[PDB]
A paper describes a structure:
In order to elucidate the mechanism of SauCas9 inhibition by [name], we determined the crystal structure of SauCas9–sgRNA–AcrIIA14ct–dsDNA quaternary complex at 2.22 Å resolution. AcrIIA14ct binds to the SauCas9 complex with a 1:1 stoichiometry partially interacting with the L2 linker and making extensive contacts with the HNH domain, which suggests that this interaction is responsible for SauCas9 inhibition. AcrIIA14ct consists of a single domain composed of a four-stranded β-sheet with four α-helices positioned along one face (β1β2β3α1α2β4α3α4). Close inspection of the interface between AcrIIA14ct and the HNH domain shows that β2, loop α2–β4, loop β4–α3 and C-terminus of AcrIIA14ct make extensive intermolecular hydrogen bond contacts with α4-α5 of the HNH domain and the loop between the HNH domain and the L2 linker. In detail, binding of AcrIIA14ct induces HNH domain and L1 linker to approach the target-guide heteroduplex. As a result, the L1 linker becomes two short α helices, whereas the former helix, together with the HNH domain, become closer to the target-guide heteroduplex. First, residue Arg617 in the loop between α5 and α6 of HNH domain hydrogen binds the sugar-phosphate backbone of the target DNA strand (fifteenth nucleotide upstream of the PAM sequence). Second, residues Lys485 and Lys489 in the L1 linker interact with the phosphate backbone between the 11th and 12th nucleotides of the sgRNA. In the crystal structure of SauCas9–sgRNA–AcrIIA14ct–dsDNA, the distance between the catalytic center of the HNH domain (D556, H557) and the scissile phosphodiester linkage in the target DNA strand (between the third and fourth nucleotides upstream of the PAM sequence) is ∼33.3 Å. This suggests that, in this structure, SauCas9 is in the precatalytic state.
A good candidate is [name] [name] (SauCas9), which is ∼300 amino acids smaller than SpyCas9 (13,14). By targeting a specific genomic sequence complementary to a single guide RNA (sgRNA) and a protospacer adjacent motif (PAM), the HNH domain is primarily responsible for cleaving the complementary strand and the RuvC domain for cleaving non-complementary strands. In this work, we investigated the mechanism by which [name], an anti-CRISPR protein from Staphylococcus, inhibits SauCas9 activity. [name] consists of an N-terminal HTH domain and a C-terminal domain which has previously been reported to inhibit SauCas9 activity in vivo and in vitro without affecting the binding of SauCas9 protein to sgRNA and target DNA but its specific inhibitory mechanism is still unclear.
Numbering used by the authors:
A (entry chain A): 3 to 724, 742 to 1052
B (entry chain E): 3 to 100
The structure:
RNA sequence: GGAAAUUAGGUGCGCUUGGCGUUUUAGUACUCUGGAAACAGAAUCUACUAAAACAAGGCAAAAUGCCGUGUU
DNA sequence: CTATTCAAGCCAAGCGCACCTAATTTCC
DNA sequence: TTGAATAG
């Protein structure tokens, strides 16, 4: 049977709707569901990888200084360095003798904390904040007559501390101090120059971005040549050739000849430049002026500027011509013609200047050319700037067509046309199904990439089950992801400090659900320069934050006609202006008697904002100054036909992949895409309800609507192959037919597929280290910290003290400080944070009790937390530690259900238990058997099944998806529901229960079975193996 | 019912004219994007509603019709376009409408 | 829709660093006891400084040494 | 077991290439 | 959102 397939491709979901071509009945519908492939996951991986490298290399730096000190008998294994203050030793060493132990302590402290090297040229005015640039500048002015160690020791003596945000210095300042220290100590200790060079080397050296990591690294590379060539792209017309370097001589000559061949000259002779005039323009203007002007071109062929058209133009309007960069850079050093007129040599120089990244490597490789360059010229060439990036063509393509650029007037695309050279198309021949690998080339965002891979697998499963469709119709979601989302919660403004300290307090107070609207009104506020666009009255930022519901985001063209929900259709205006506007365009509204400004004033203010840098969009301007009557049906169908294409890059790439696939293998499938808002547009006119927290089915519903959309646009075109109101009534009639609408609303066999995750070596455990204590009963308790003690909204300390003051360690040790704290709690008990009120009223922080009032400020307070069960003991890393030191939250890999004497039990496998062997992973058998013994699982027990994240489990007849082991000791597992989240399930019932499903696997468990789905949601029960799997590849 | 001239704007292609048609319940606003000079200069009121207009915008009738929100003084359609221009010319200059 | 160029902006992969942060140990200050005082003892709370560990762990063996939270 | 409670490493600084968007000129 | 401890 013949069918139409609709797809709704989202961030977390792929909805599919399969409906009949003739009957228009729904054959099947469902949703494939998966985690968002957010970039923060990889960001975190590569961040942690980078943090491991820093830590390893700083340790290796310390050990190499330590070996230098051993080699010169300045350190032994018997050396005692404990009581030496290295600040005092560093200061005193700058002018007096240090003992061997003091000298070693000073050098080792310098080596551990050695400063930045790359901020050092940049200096800023102080804005008094957490920037390292500003702190380097403040410290550079504080060091004008002081060494680093001198300033640090003054901070230690006056303020009582050295470490922290203040402690950021330049490496070159540590080097100055280290040289003065070594200059003094060489008079008193037996060192040589090799000591000084080796130590200063260890102190200042680090790797460069182009050197990368040491030998053996999968992330590394053997030389700069390999590094750059693997990064750089390939030619458009010769895809096995690497691109030319951007500023190669022949590439800029190619650009210049393209610029000249696109000129049209108003004169009695030829409209186009002939060869010898191009020769004279290259040799007399482009090889004489660094930035050529139109006046110099016109003077060289003896016309005036207005007789010349066709030139590229700046945004200012000034004419733009190719600059001959290497020619003029090498020319200012050297005008010898055996250098400057060797095009091949200039290309080689430009390649070397672009690939290699330092002056010394430039000089070595330029010297290795064995040219007629002098050494003094090579040293000046090596310091040229700007040699970065690639041209989009290879030199093969450029040098292939350069002669025809000289002696014809054709530009590059005409010449590649005449030569029958076409950009590369990827072969798709011996493929039984759509491969996911062609996604890897063209896509950029990881979220869209996962969605596309899942969309292709869904299409392949649909063609495999139902056969080939006649039409595939696709809608991609829009209007943000939840990634750039968070980047507006981080970026927050350009004018950061004084404003963003108070939006940060407003946004954090505000719940995460109803707070994206406010940041979008801020975005619109900044692009409208704080002006309501319908009254041209100022909107105060502060009033927008305290009273956001006094300012509305209005759709420029109404949703009833536009179906555009981007920033190009939305503006920020006052509530009463959006109310008086109503269902109108700005033209209709401002021309009435309801407006406070005229349309002409509005149009001038919009057209002046239409210009400039960071300008308002062209489609925004076209919406704002729409003058047609949007109530007329021809205009409405113009808005539909114009804005249904989905012009976006990812969509075009997916359509080209699919159309190429069906074209190559002789499959007649028409594939079309519609834009985002359009289906919601159709539901707004088919009376589909606003409340759609009724589960994941709304994704499959949208896919069903997308499939019937195809019918509407075929029956329109047979209508346009053709007494006005009757015709409008036939377009509007077949647009509005509710026959299929009730057929979708009554559908009730939706299927759901949740993607299962079985990857090993995910996060093993939480980073935070915890100390512990023993009580009188011998229980081991975790010690927790209260910080942010003076934050205004922090009531944690108050609730703890009023409920259970004995939990504070201070309560038992130092009860006089506790009394001070209790007094503040009494005095400001009605406030949310009493220490904040204390600080505000008194200007002081709480100090530790002392009789002379010289007690230290208290900034975090320890209390006795929960009993220690599940943990990783790391105490061995901390020698002579009086208590256990732990990490917590043992992340679970899977649980294995057993049936033992009529009682269901399970073994948890932790990510910690899954060990990487040669080319695979192995469940730890010793940990697995200790788990079986802990759970009293006998050898007579039957293995039932293994359950991973999002495996389906049926417990006591009810089917759930697995989250993970909640509690191994108490046999608890967390699950969620399959057609809906449990949160939404309870909110539909108006139920206040906590939205987590915990199940206890024990004697009240009557039945456990494992199910599974294919990618389309078809359920099947799994026959599990006899044994739990040990190896994962 | 009373017809008011509420808003005008001199364009190159004639003038733009807004007319409010008001009874005790409703305000029906008619936007005439381009009425020619031959009608405006000679007060030919009776020809105005022959010209193309946008769909009328219906809203609740206002309590008074003295001036619009831009500041122009509202004139009854029977009084003519020249009365509207004469009363409002200077403010129309201020608001780029003349 | 596709090709090239100029400018501004954005995203991603990967590389190189900094200062923090958590925790232990030691010293010092703080509290308590003895004492005229150096000092000694107790307490391990609060802070500062140093040294060390920081996904469990796996390589390697003087080395600007390497790998371990991503995707499929 | 049900309902609750607790808390979960961070921000600043620089570089290579790839890709995308927006504006402009020519052609296919 | 999730490991997981706790009061009842």
């Amino acid at each position: 049977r013949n069918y139409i397939l609709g797809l709704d491709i989202g961030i977390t979901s792929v909805g599919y709707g399969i409906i009949d071509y003739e009957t228009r009945d729904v054959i099947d519908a469902g949703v494939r569901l998966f985690k968002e492939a957010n970039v923060e996951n990889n960001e975190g991986r590569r961040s942690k990888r980078g943090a491991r490298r820093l830590k390893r290399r700083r340790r290796h730096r310390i050990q190499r200084v330590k070996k230098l000190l051993f080699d010169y008998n300045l350190l032994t294994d018997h050396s005692e360095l404990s009581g030496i203050n290295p600040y005092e030793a560093r200061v005193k060493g700058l002018s007096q003798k240090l003992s061997e132990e003091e000298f070693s302590a000073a050098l080792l402290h310098l080596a551990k904390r050695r400063g930045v090297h790359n901020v050092n040229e940049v200096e800023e005015d102080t804005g008094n904040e957490l920037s390292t640039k500003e702190q380097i500048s403040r410290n550079s002015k504080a060091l004008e007559e002081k060494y680093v160690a001198e300033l640090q020791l003054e901070r230690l003596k006056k303020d009582g501390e050295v470490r922290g945000s203040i402690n950021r210095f330049k490496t070159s300042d540590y080097v100055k101090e280290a040289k003065q220290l070594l200059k003094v100590q060489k008079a008193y200790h037996q060192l040589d120059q090799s000591f000084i060079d080796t130590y200063i080397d260890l102190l200042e050296t680090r790797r460069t971005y182009y050197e990368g990591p040491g030998e053996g690294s999968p992330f590394g590379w053997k030389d700069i040549k390999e590094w750059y060539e693997m990064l750089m792209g390939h030619c458009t017309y010769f895809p096995e050739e690497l691109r030319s370097v951007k500023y190669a001589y022949n590439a800029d000559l190619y650009n210049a000849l393209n610029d000249l061949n696109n000129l049209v000259i108003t004169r009695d002779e030829n409209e186009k430049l002939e060869y010898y005039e191009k020769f004279q323009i290259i040799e007399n203007v482009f090889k004489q002026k660094k930035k050529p002007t139109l006046k110099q071109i016109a003077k060289e062929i003896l016309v005036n500027e207005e007789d010349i058209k066709g030139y590229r133009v700046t945004s200012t309007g000034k004419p733009e011509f190719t600059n001959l960069k290497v020619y003029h850079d090498i020319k200012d050093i050297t005008a010898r013609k055996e250098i400057i007129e060797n095009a091949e040599l200039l290309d080689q120089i430009a390649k070397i200047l672009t690939i290699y990244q330092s002056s010394e490597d430039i000089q070595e490789e330029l010297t290795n050319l064995n040219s007629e360059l002098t050494q003094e010229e090579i040293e000046q060439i090596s310091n040229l700037k700007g040699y970065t990036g690639t041209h989009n063509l290879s030199l093969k393509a450029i040098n292939l067509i350069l002669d025809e650029l000289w002696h014809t007037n054709d530009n590059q695309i005409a010449i590649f046309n005449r030569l029958k050279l076409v950009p590369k198309k990827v072969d798709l021949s011996q493929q039984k199904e759509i491969p996911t690998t062609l996604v890897d080339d063209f896509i950029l965002s990881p979220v869209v990439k996962r969605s596309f891979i899942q969309s292709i697998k869904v299409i392949n499963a649909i063609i495999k089950k139902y056969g080939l469709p006649n039409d595939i119709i696709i809608e991609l979601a829009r209007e943000k992801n939840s990634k750039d989302a968070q980047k507006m919660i981080n970026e927050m403004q350009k004018r950061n400090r004084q404003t963003n300290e108070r939006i940060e307090e407003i946004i954090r107070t505000t719940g995460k659900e109803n707070a994206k609207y406010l940041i979008e009104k801020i975005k619109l506020h900044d692009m409208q320069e704080g002006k309501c666009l319908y009254s041209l009255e100022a909107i105060p930022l502060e009033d927008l934050l305290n009273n956001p519901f006094n300012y509305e985001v209005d759709h420029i063209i109404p949703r009833s006609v536009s179906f555009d929900n981007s920033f190009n259709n939305k503006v920020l205006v006052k509530q009463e202006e959006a109310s008086k506007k109503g269902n109108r365009t700005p033209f209709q509204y401002l021309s009435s008697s309801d407006s406070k400004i005229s349309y002409e004033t509005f149009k001038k203010h919009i057209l002046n904002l239409a210009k400039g840098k960071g300008r308002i969009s062209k489609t925004k301007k076209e919406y704002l100054l729409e003058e047609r009557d949007i109530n007329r049906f021809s205009v409405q169908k113009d808005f539909i036909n114009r804005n249904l294409v989905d012009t976006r890059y990812a969509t075009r790439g997916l359509m080209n992949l699919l159309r190429s696939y069906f074209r190559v293998n002789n499959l007649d499938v028409k594939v079309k895409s519609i834009n985002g808002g359009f289906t919601s547009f159709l539901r707004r006119k088919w009376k589909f309800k606003k409340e759609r927290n009724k589960g994941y089915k709304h994704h499959a519903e949208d896919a069903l609507i997308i499939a019937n959309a195809d019918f509407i646009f075929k029956e329109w075109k047979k209508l346009d192959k053709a007494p006005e109101i009757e015709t409008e009534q036939e377009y509007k009639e077949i647009f509005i037919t509710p026959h299929q609408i009730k057929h979708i609303k009554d559908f009730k066999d939706y299927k759901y597929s949740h993607r299962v995750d079985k990857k090993p070596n995910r996060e093993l455990i939480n980073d935070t280290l915890y100390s512990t204590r023993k009580d009188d009963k011998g229980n081991t308790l975790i010690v927790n910290n209260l910080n942010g003690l003076y934050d205004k909204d922090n009531d944690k300390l108050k609730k703890l003290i009023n409920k259970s003051p004995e939990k504070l360690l201070m309560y038992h040790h130092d009860p006089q400080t506790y009394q001070k704290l209790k007094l503040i709690m009494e005095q400001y008990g009605d406030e949310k944070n009493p220490l904040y009120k204390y600080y505000e009223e008194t200007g002081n922080y709480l100090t530790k009790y002392s009789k002379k009032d010289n007690g230290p400020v208290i900034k975090k307070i320890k209390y006795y937390g929960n009993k220690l069960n599940a943990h990783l003991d790391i105490t061995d890393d901390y020698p002579n530690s009086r208590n256990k030191v732990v990490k917590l939250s043992l992340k679970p890999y899977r649980f294995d259900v057993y049936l033992d004497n009529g009682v269901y039990k399970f073994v948890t496998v932790k990510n910690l238990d899954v060990i990487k062997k040669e080319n695979y992973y192995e469940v730890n058998s010793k940990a697995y058997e200790e788990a079986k013994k802990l759970k009293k699982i006998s050898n007579q027990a039957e293995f039932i099944a293994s359950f991973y994240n999002n495996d389906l489990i049926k417990i006591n007849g009810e089917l759930y998806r697995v989250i993970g082991v909640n509690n191994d000791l108490l046999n608890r597992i967390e699950v969620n529901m399959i057609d809906i989240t449990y949160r939404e399930y309870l909110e539909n019932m108006n139920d206040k229960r906590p939205p987590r499903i915990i199940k206890t696997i024990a004697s009240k468990t009557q039945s456990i079975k494992k199910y599974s789905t294919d990618i389309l949601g078809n359920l099947y029960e799994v026959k599990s193996k006899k044994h739990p799997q040990i190896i994962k590849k | 019912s009373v017809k008011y001239i509420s808003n005008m704007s001199k364009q190159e292609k004639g003038y733009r004219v807004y007319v409010n048609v008001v009874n005790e319940d409703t305000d029906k606003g008619f936007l005439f994007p381009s009425v020619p000079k031959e009608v405006i200069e000679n007060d030919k009121i009776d020809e105005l509603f022959n010209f193309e207009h946008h769909k009328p915008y219906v809203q609740k009738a206002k309590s008074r019709y003295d001036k619009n929100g831009i500041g122009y003084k509202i004139v009854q359609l029977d009084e003519g376009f020249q009365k509207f221009i004469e009363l409002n010319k200077e403010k129309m200059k201020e608001n780029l409408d003349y």
